[PDB]
Design a protein around this ligand. Structure first.
Ligand code: PRF
Ligand code: MG
Lengths: 1316, 613
RNA sequence: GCAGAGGUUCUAGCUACACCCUCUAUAAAAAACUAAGGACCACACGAG
DNA sequence: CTCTGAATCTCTTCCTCGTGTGGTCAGGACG
DNA sequence: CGTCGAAGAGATTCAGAG
């Protein structure tokens, strides 16, 4: 089946792999993420409620005064998006919070509260997100890009190579919390564990262990296996376990019960250890020379004098052992030191330890944390427990707990957010294991270790920051003020929470300005994820392995699209199918595979779960029965593709375009061109200005009907029905019966946005796409947006392109353009530009807005009305006067030079208190009349629809229609309707209509007041006027023009039509490209797109020939069916026998310009199908035809390539580039040019240009670049008079910058002068 | 506010921004001669405002400056006529943005045009390293009379033909003109007009324009070959030489002094550069500017008539590729089975796989090349004959117009083995070209190299800039102040060989310098060349005959002049083929010429004899 | 402004480097003379 | 035992032109 | 109404043996 609009222009589709999952709503990463930030969560997790919970306990210290949060809600926004864009006020919503305050009795924590105080307080002004996912801040659409930062948890780096410059590896561990202080354990070349917090100076590791109430015996037992020695009268018999002996060389011969197993001086073999274990011997004799070298494990004391014989963690001393031997401690303990496996990295660190007690360790910690501060017995205790084990000063997120417990091989998922004593020692043991050989380091760049942070989480964090500040205020207030003396509103201020949220939304490194160059630029900008910003890495700190694309980017992020320049590979865009996990990580869909059959149910796989599995490839031929058709299937197991068997695989890619991003997926034949060129082909689409008459792409990927709809440019109908009244500014649809609600359904109205300035000064326009009586289905486009045709993305205009050198006018990247292009107006774009004049209130009197301009002629005032405002519709040019402003003794706003446009509208803002002038009154009255007419037109049409609905019930119940006509149509209540199930519904409808009348009689007055009230303004301005200019920029030699495949170049000449080459039939080509750019830069896709375009236009020409002369419908139908079949099997298989033979005549009209062709990126049309399509019409199979020279008229040998190529016009137009200046304003340092910009400026004679001058013998020109031109107050004013006089002389003077440097050094206490 | 890139010393004292400036995008500008460049009227009007005021005052049109300003803003007919006066002989400096070396900022004579883009002679789009993908040049103006004369006697584009880094020319024809000349100078074994006799080039151009004879046809023509063998005299000899019609048409463009053994070969790119160099060497400068300006016109005009287009059928996939792929798969499978049997180690098997894949890649590349160049076959009025191909992709590679065999290897044959981000070679190479489809995995692998290469730009340029700055500020003060140190010792010079072919002969390094001690003929006690004579080409040719390997040469390391090197100790200026003038700033020239190639520079048994001897 | 004063105009116009004219108590007959206050930081973009 | 070298800590610099948007003290009474 | 990361040189640290 096919929808009605789908039947209008159905696109021939290539591709053999049948997709299973439709592409999701592209913007669903931002909308859903913000939906979890303001929507109510009874769960109160990751929600405005989860932010309140923590900051709302409110307890005055011993003040028995408590305040608790109960409920919150968002008030209705004061202004809509449209009504706030003009005023510039943020699209916000008040935040109403209900707070409960109760008062306990004195010294009664358990006593009942004597009274309850409940009220609703207004705090903060939280912004809101438009339907497309754009925040309005100050009248400018702003979007917030998601961030990608290292996830909270624990990571074990390696720091291989450069450290210690001796080939050693220094293993280190970090504990990064979500909100707190970094804790880092780091090894040393001397093999000593060192603890370092917040990147401070080092510290022996045991110091942070001693602070945890841990004894030396406990510390030793927590890191080592103790070897037990027992005193015997048999040469100090010791218990020897074979496992520990394994890995140890035979220091002495090993015997038990008078039998030797391992010989002295011989390395012990695994077989020897196995036979020792078989013998199951426990005790093995040992010389006293082996025990003396063993470090003791536990402290041993004598029972006579009470003192300790040997201290624990002390190397054994034979004299100490002899004292222990005479004392006779039945058990002797030593730790099992083994340099091969059980490296003693704790004992040496404990030797380095300078303290012996917990208090000393705390004192050392305080000294290191706060240098220069005298210690205190309580300050250090408080500081240490606050740094880590405090709920407020340290909080690992739930994601942090999950990651930290997974890296430590735990089993639970949820746990306490604060660090625990056992967790630190577990991290220490893991680090020691890493050092010993077990385990492995974790890769930082692994996409399982970098969560994604959308707008909602950042907004919640900012709200929490504001909340803790206001909490610090309210708690302090609650202690001083007497209890139950005032309402709970006084203790709280809305602004501290506000200046924290509005500051983030307005000025941030992530709340970026939104570019609206295309429906695709918006889509690819709300999706872009960047690694910069707060909590992330900067450009200077960005290494080179981070920018590289990891093997785990397959399907989670785009490996092609990244902005070139400084931040390359740091702002990679999200893929098309990737969807964020619940914890923040990235997920990519896959299809579950049973033993032999690939099912239909799909699975979303995380970044880490993808590893242990084996995943097949999208290019795996399937029998449609679920079984693979070959015996060996390529897969991707451990980030390394290889060949496997059919039975091994258990996952396949969902589709074939899931690796690429949105924009990069629009390039047809993407797989044919190098990635280096696709990187710019995907970056030269987001800069294509929307042209005048948008034209569909003759050869598009197939993702054009999913970028226009999913963005906001188009206007999709949310209800199905028929079109009642269309117009160039509004579309009224009458809904069906089933799709409408039983009551108050009525009809739906869409308002189209006419020409409005965009953020890049391009026009934003909506054009109707339907006609009266045409049925419209649910979720169907009926309003083509800017750069969008028939609900199908269309950025450029397909042009007939021929590849050949043409007299050097397309030298190496230039593009020759025929006059036929300009004549057809195929590239003349609109450029709406906005101007503003401000009337400040200076001293000596405010400036006037009047039209009486002194010292001006009568010509300039012709384009000015009485009030001093330009007429709406005049054609102004460069230097003309727009609005008259005379400064109190000529400051009237003037059009900037070069701009030549027509004023489309003028809006005047007036501050309350000052009087509105005549033109302001005219504008206000016009807007009021338009608002009243809108509120009346909506009622008139809604009444038509509602009364049409009413007649359906009026005929049900045996009521004659004529009598209803006799009584007034507005009120049918006079008749007694027959009682039924619909009579009550109709009475409810009428009562709601009457209530609606009373509601409208109030909303009209509300609108009256809203328009009339003087708007707010910045302090010190009376009235500000905005004037809009609408230039129509044409195409010009110098304007950039780029294809889709990565080919760019400026136009070099607008050749006359006759000079262009022409094929045999007489049609002249429109663009002459340079072929010499194809072999060097392997973008061979474009040569393979031109042939497809030529085939499409050839079929279009055949259809047009069939249509131009009268032809039977069957002829057209059979030809189009043939075209849609086209040989090799395709997924589409669209049939024409079901069309009613009248929609065929409309499809032919929509195809006569050329049948569109789809081409999914990585399963596109093979060249055989292109050849068959070429042979379907008439054009030669090879794709080249014999052109003819225009000037000479002779023939071109070696026939050249012709066809149709999609060509965008990049917005780097030449009219915004020329700047040249001679004289003008200067700076404070008198370096005259002041910087080339909108303000006059001279191009910088930079540092290297001085060297380039010195390389020649030119010095006089260097002197004139450095002294007279740039900065010489007595040089400029002298040579400006010398030149007009007639003599070109010079006087050097001496630059003012040197007189500035002399002062900047003389004011430094250094006397620098000049001799003579 | 003193130190750093923001301080005065590097922001406001060295690099002062200047008045009388401008900016615009680039355009091909083919028609203007190489001594002139385009300029929009709406820019030249604003640049030359004081000159216009002065000329209006001289004409008496404007009584005061106010009226002159008013009439200038009027943009009436009189103002344009005045502007066409102050623009007549007033050079302007077309300065590229990142001027790495001396030729970055050159002078040009303006030619007023409409539009809004700055035109540029194509032959100088190489020294600038200026593309046309929307690049932006800045226009400066010299004001004083001395500046106007300097931008004429030193900076005009016709004055710096040879780069200061090396004697080789810098205005070598680059992309379209070279392809046109290559397509002009060729031969098809059977085209209409074969074996005919032609009176001369004046008649060959007519016989080709009429269409009676194809551009390529082996014929017999007579040519007046002028010779300068007599000192200062032109000897005219005329012999019936055998060549093509296309080569004969090309003869009239070349000046008379040059012989005929240059326009007879296939005329790739290096041949054209050598032709320009010989013209400069034996004819001077004035008859070389005209020649290099005329060659571009001919090249463009005969590359437009060629219709050299690229089509899909051009990029042939060799038939042997499928068999090579299958056999390589069999060999790797054999090694895999051996590893699974424990016979070989993992590393040894990996090395064997890499080596066999490299061998297979070279084999398939050779097969594609042999099926690309030779495979053309046509008739010679009889049986079939072999002939070098006319494939457009091949003609864009043999001529050196754009691209080398390595890129074509990526268009028809297999891409090869790609490198992992960590510097390792992936076990399985990409067995698919670009004309064929590229798989998903074979593209995700390919993106690694593209990302690394694009990220290395933002560090190669950042490091080359610092190296160039240090090298500039370390010399910064060398000026040739004295004409003769009079010293005796100079560093030795010998050819450098690594064991293969000689990397640099003694005829290359020594040329342009001055000897220290009297170089002696191999016959002893014979002084071939005196001790203090400069060595030009007529001397290096003599040195080749005697075959001497060690020649002492004075160098600026052994000069004894304080605060400046000598003129003799520095040798040839390498920009003009004469001894360096007393004063030229050579301190910065070397620093720029060393730090300039820092952009394209990459940041990272039994010995068998070569020949009998 | 010869010194003081006023000045056509072509913003303002004995200094900004300034300049000229007529006139004798105060403005009014005339042409030739000039070019002004604009800092820092984030984000995005292009090219080498 | 006193330099001998040998770690160890501290300061420096890391391209060059443009095209554009947006945001921003200092320090609120005070007599 | 003023008025109150890398990476490299160099200078500290610091050391080991005859
Ligand atoms: N502004 C009055 C006036 C008219 N003419 C003038 N000429 C000169 N040199 N200076 C002036 O001030 C005037
Ligand atoms: Mg370029």
């Amino acid at each position: 089946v096919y929808s009605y609009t789908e039947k209008k222009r159905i696109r021939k589709d290539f591709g053999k792999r049948p997709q299973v999952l439709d592409v999701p709503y592209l913007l669903s990463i931002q909308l859903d993420s913000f939906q979890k930030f303001i929507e109510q969560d009874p769960e109160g997790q990751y929600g405005l409620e989860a932010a309140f919970r923590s900051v709302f306990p409110i307890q005055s210290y011993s003040g028995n005064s408590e305040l608790q949060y109960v409920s919150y809600r968002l008030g209705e926004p004061v202004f809509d998006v449209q009504e706030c864009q003009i005023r510039g006020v943020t699209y916000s919503a008040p935040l109403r919070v209900k707070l409960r305050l109760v008062i306990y009795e004195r010294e009664a924590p358990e006593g009942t509260v004597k009274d309850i105080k409940e009220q609703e307080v207004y705090m903060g002004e939280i912004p809101l997100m438009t339907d497309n996912g754009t925040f309005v801040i100050n009248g400018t659409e702003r979007v917030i890009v998601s961030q990608l930062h290292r996830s909270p948890g624990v990571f074990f780096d390696s720091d291989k190579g450069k450290t210690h410059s001796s080939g050693k590896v220094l293993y280190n561990a970090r504990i990064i919390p979500y909100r707190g202080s970094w804790l880092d354990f780091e090894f040393d070349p001397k093999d000593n564990l060192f603890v370092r917090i917040d990147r401070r100076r080092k510290l022996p590791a045991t110091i942070i262990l001693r602070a945890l109430n841990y004894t030396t015996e406990q510390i030793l037992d927590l890191f080592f296996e103790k070897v037990i020695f027992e005193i015997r009268d048999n040469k100090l018999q010791m218990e020897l376990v074979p496992e520990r002996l394994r890995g140890e060389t035979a220091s002495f011969d090993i015997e038990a019960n008078g039998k030797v197993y391992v010989e002295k001086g011989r390395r012990i073999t695994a077989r020897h250890i196995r036979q020792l274990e078989k013998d199951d011997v426990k005790l093995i004799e040992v010389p006293v020379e082996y025990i003396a070298g063993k470090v003791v494990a536990k402290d041993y004391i004598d029972e006579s004098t009470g003192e300790l014989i040997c201290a624990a963690n002390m190397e054994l001393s034979l004299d100490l052992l002899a004292k222990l031997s005479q004392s006779g401690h039945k058990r002797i303990e030593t730790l099992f030191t083994n340099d091969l496996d059980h490296g003693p990295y704790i004992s040496e660190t404990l030797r380095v330890d300078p303290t012996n007690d917990r208090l000393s360790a705390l004192v050392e910690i305080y000294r290191m944390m706060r240098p220069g501060e005298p210690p205190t017995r309580e300050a250090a205790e408080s500081l240490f427990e606050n740094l880590f084990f405090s709920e407020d000063r340290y909080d690992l997120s739930a994601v942090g707990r999950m990651k930290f417990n997974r890296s430590l091989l735990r089993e639970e998922i949820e746990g306490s957010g604060i660090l625990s004593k056992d967790d630190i020692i577990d991290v220490m043991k893991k680090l020691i294991d890493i050092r010993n050989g077990k385990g492995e380091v974790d890769d930082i760049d692994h996409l399982g270790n970098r969560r994604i942070r959308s707008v909602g989480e950042m907004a919640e964090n900012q709200f929490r920051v504001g909340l803790v500040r206001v909490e610090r205020a309210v708690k302090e207030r609650l202690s001083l003020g007497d209890l139950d003396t005032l309402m709970p509103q006084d203790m709280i201020n809305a602004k501290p929470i506000s200046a924290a949220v509005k500051e983030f939304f307005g000025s941030s490194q992530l709340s970026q300005f939104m570019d609206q160059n295309n429906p695709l630029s918006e889509i690819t900008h709300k999706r872009r994820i960047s690694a910069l910003g707060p909590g992330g890495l900067t450009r200077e700190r960005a290494g080179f392995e981070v920018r590289d694309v990891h093997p785990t980017h397959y399907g989670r992020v785009c490996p092609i699209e990244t902005p070139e320049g400084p931040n390359i590979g740091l702002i990679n865009s999200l893929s098309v199918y990737a969807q964020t996990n619940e914890y923040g990580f990235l997920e990519t869909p896959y299809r579950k595979v049973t033993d032999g059959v690939v099912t239909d149910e799909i699975h979303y796989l995380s970044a880490i779960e993808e590893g242990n599995y084996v995943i097949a490839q999208a290019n795996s031929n399937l029998d449609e029965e679920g079984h693979f058709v070959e015996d060996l299937v390529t897969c991707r197991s451990k980030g390394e593709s290889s060949l496997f068997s059919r039975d091994q695989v258990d996952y396949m890619d969902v589709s074939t375009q899931q690796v690429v991003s949105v924009g990069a997926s629009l390039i047809p034949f993407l797989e044919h061109d190098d990635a280096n060129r696709a990187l710019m082909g995907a970056n030269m689409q987001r800069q294509a200005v929307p042209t005048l008459r948008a034209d569909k792409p003759l050869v598009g990927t197939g993702m054009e009907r999913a970028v226009a709809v999913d963005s906001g440019v188009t206007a999709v109908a949310k209800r199905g029905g028929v079109v009642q009244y269309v117009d160039a500014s509004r579309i009224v649809i009458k809904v069906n019966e089933d799709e409408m609600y039983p009551g108050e359904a009525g009809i739906d109205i869409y308002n189209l946005t006419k020409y409005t300035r965009s953020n890049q000064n391009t026009c934003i326009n909506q054009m109707p796409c339907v006609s009266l009586g045409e049925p419209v289905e649910r979720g169907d486009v009926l309003a083509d947006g800017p750069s969008t045709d028939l609900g199908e993305l269309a950025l450029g205009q397909n042009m007939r392109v021929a590849f050949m050198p043409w007299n050097g006018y397309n030298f190496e990247d230039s593009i020759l353009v025929s006059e036929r292009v300009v004549q057809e107006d195929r590239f003349t774009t609109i450029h709406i530009q906005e101007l503003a004049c401000v009337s400040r209130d200076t001293k000596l009197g405010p400036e006037e807005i009047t039209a009486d301009i002194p010292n001006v002629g009568e010509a300039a005032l012709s384009k000015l009305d009485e009030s001093g405002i330009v007429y709406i519709g005049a054609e102004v040019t460069g230097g003309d006067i727009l609005v008259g402003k005379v400064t109190p003794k000529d400051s009237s706003l003037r059009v900037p030079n070069g701009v030549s446009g027509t004023v489309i509208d003028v809006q005047v803002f007036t501050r309350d208190g000052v009087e509105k002038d005549k033109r302001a009154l005219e504008i206000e009255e016009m807007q009021l009349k338009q608002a009243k007419k809108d509120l009346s037109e909506e009622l008139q049409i809604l009444e038509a629809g509602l009364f049409s609905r009413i007649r359906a019930v009026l005929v049900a119940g045996g009521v004659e229609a004529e009598k209803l006509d006799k009584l007034p149509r507005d009120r049918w209540l006079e008749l007694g309707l027959t009682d039924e199930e619909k009579q009550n519904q109709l009475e409810q409808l009428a009562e709601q209509y009457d209530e609606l009348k009373h509601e409208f009689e109030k909303k009209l007055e509300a609108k009256r007041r809203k328009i009339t009230q003087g708007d707010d303004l910045a302090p010190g301005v009376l009235k500000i006027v905005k004037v809009y200019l609408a230039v129509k920029r044409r195409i010009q030699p110098g304007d950039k023009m780029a294809g889709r495949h990565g080919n760019k170049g400026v136009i070099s000449k607008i050749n006359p039509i006759e000079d262009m080459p022409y094929d045999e039939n007489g049609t002249p080509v429109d663009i002459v490209l340079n072929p010499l750019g194809v072999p060097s830069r392997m973008n061979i896709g474009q040569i393979l797109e031109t042939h497809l375009g030529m085939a499409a236009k050839g079929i279009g020409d055949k259809i047009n020939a069939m249509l131009k002369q009268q032809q039977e419908v069957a002829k057209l139908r059979e030809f189009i069916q043939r075209a849609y079949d086209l040989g090799a099997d395709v997924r589409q298989k669209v049939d024409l026998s079901t069309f009613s033979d009248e929609e065929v005549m409309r499809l032919a009209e929509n195809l006569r310009k050329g049948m569109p062709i789809a081409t999914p990126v990585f399963d596109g049309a093979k060249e055989a199908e292109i050849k068959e399509l070429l042979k379907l019409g008439d054009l030669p199979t090879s794709g080249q035809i014999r052109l003819y020279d225009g000037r000479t008229g002779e023939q071109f040998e070696r026939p050249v390539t012709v066809g149709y190529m999609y060509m965008l016009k990049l917005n780097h137009l030449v009219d915004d580039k020329m700047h040249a200046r001679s004289t003008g304003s200067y700076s404070l340092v008198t370096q005259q040019p002041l910087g080339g910009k909108a303000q006059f400026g001279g191009q910088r004679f930079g540092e290297m240009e001085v060297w380039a001058l010195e390389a020649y013998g030119a010095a006089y020109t260097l002197q004139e670049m450095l002294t007279v031109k740039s900065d010489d107050v007595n040089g400029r004013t002298k040579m400006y008079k010398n030149i007009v006089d007639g003599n070109h002389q010079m006087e050097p003077g001496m630059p003012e910058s040197f007189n500035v440097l002399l002062k900047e050094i003389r004011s430094l206490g250094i006397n620098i002068e000049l001799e003579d | 506010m003193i130190k750093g890139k923001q301080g005065r010393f590097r922001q406001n004292l060295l690099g002062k921004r200047v008045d009388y400036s401008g900016r615009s995008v680039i355009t091909v500008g083919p028609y203007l001669r190489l001594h002139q460049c385009g300029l929009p009227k709406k820019m030249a009007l604003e640049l030359f405002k004081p000159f216009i005021y002065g000329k209006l005052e001289l004409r008496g049109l404007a009584t005061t400056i106010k009226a002159a300003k008013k009439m200038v803003e009027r943009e009436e007919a009189v103002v344009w006529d005045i502007l066409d006066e102050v623009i007549r002989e007033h050079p302007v400096l077309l300065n590229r943005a990142p001027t790495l070396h001396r030729l970055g900022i050159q002078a040009f004579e303006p030619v007023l045009i409409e539009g809004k883009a700055i035109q540029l002679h194509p032959l100088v789009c190489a020294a600038y390293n200026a593309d046309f993908d929307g690049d932006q040049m800045a226009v400066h103006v010299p004001l004083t009379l001395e500046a106007q004369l300097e931008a004429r006697a030193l900076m005009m584009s016709t004055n710096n033909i040879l780069s200061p880094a090396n004697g080789e020319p810098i205005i070598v024809p680059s992309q379209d003109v070279v392809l046109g000349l290559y397509y002009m100078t060729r031969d098809c074994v059977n085209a209409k007009g074969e074996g005919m006799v032609l009176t001369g080039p004046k008649e060959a151009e007519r016989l080709y324009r009429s269409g009676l004879a194809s551009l390529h046809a082996r014929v017999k023509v007579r040519i007046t070959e002028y010779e300068k063998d007599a000192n200062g005299e032109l000897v005219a000899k005329t012999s019936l030489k055998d060549t093509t019609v296309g080569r004969a048409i090309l003869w009239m463009i070349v000046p008379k002094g040059l012989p005929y053994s240059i326009v007879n070969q296939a005329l790739g790119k290096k041949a054209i550069s050598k032709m320009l160099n010989t013209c400069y060497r034996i004819l001077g400068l004035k008859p070389t500017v005209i020649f290099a300006d005329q060659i571009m016109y001919t090249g463009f005009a005969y590359a437009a008539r060629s219709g050299a287009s690229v089509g899909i059928d051009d990029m042939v996939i060799p038939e042997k590729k499928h068999e090579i792929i299958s056999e390589a798969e069999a060999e790797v499978a054999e090694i895999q089975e051996q590893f699974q049997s424990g016979l070989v180690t993992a590393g040894e098997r990996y090395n064997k796989v890499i080596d066999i894949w490299a061998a297979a890649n070279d084999r398939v590349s050779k097969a594609m090349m042999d099926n690309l160049q030779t495979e053309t076959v046509i008739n010679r009025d009889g049986q079939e004959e072999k002939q070098v191909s006319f494939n457009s992709i091949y003609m864009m590679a043999d001529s050196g117009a754009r691209g080398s065999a390595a890129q074509i290897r990526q268009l028809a044959g297999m891409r090869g083995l790609m490198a992992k981000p960590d510097g390792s070679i992936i076990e399985t190479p990409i067995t698919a070209n670009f004309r064929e489809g590229l798989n998903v995995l074979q593209y995700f692998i390919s993106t690694h190299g593209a990302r690394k290469g694009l990220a290395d730009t933002a560090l190669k340029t950042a490091n080359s800039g610092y190296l160039t700055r240090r090298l500039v500020d370390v010399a910064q003060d060398l000026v040739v102040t004295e004409d003769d140190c009079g010293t005796h010792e100079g560093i030795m010079m010998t050819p450098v060989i690594e064991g293969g072919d000689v990397k640099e002969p003694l005829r290359d390094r020594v040329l342009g310098r001055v000897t220290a001690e009297d170089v002696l003929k191999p016959g002893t006690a014979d002084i071939l060349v005196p001790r203090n004579t400069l060595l030009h080409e007529q001397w290096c040719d003599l040195l080749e005959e005697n075959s001497v390997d060690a020649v002492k040469v004075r160098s600026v390391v052994s000069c004894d002049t304080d605060f400046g090197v000598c003129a003799h100790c520095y040798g040839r200026d390498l920009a003009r083929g004469h001894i360096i003038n007393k004063g030229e700033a050579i301190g910065v020239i070397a620093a720029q010429s060393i730090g300039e190639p820092g952009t394209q520079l990459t940041m990272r048994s039994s010995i068998q004899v070569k020949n009998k001897g």
